[PDB]
């Protein structure tokens, strides 16, 4: 488990060093965007979080593409990562499923949280939002999912 080094934490697997710097560059930036840089506007503070969410998402996409896509590491490296909280087991378990392949997060597919219905507009393909932009003619009001800043999360866009 623990992100902290501690004695219980089973020492690294092998290929680790080859990736180690790519990891650390994300890591510093988290320490960077958690820094409490004040703003009076709600719109901002939520933006601030939109970083942390984004980074976390990239790190996981990276480890994921290494292990599954190109198979450039070994099962024990990978599983050691995931044990150390380097990447989301779960989220990656979505990226393996058919449609979700490019998914945001796991709030953005929650059915139960949203007032009605489901699934932030975050998911719908642009190919349709554009259709209501056709008929109605207002272009398209959507830009950022309040939770993330997804824009066309669905795996076509």
């Amino acid at each position: 488990m623990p992100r902290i080094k501690t004695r219980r934490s089973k020492p690294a697997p092998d290929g680790f060093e080859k990736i180690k710097p790519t990891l650390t560059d994300f890591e510093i930036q988290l320490r960077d965007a958690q820094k409490d840089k004040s703003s009076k506007l709600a719109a901002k503070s939520n933006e601030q979080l939109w970083e942390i969410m984004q980074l976390h998402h990239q790190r996981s996409r990276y480890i994921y593409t290494l292990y599954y896509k190109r198979k450039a590491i070994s099962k024990d490296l990978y599983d050691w990562l995931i044990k150390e909280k380097y990447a989301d087991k779960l989220l990656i378990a979505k990226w393996r499923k058919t449609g979700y392949e490019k998914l945001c997060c796991l709030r953005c597919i929650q059915k139960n949280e949203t007032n009605n219905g489901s699934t932030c507009i975050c998911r719908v393909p642009r190919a349709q939002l554009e259709e209501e932009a056709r008929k109605k003619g207002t272009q398209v009001s959507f830009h950022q999912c309040v939770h993330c800043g997804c824009r066309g999360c669905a795996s076509t866009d």
């Binding site: 939109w50 984004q54 642009r126 190919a127 830009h143 997804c150 824009r151 066309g152 076509t156 866009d157």
Partner: peptide, 23 residues
């Protein structure tokens, strides 16, 4: 729509996936 149309069409968004901004 068509697959070619989509594939070509997307690169337009500024920053890869999915945070990348159309327009």
């Amino acid at each position: 729509f068509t697959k070619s149309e989509l594939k070509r069409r997307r690169k337009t968004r500024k920053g890869d996936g999915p945070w990348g901004s159309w327009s």
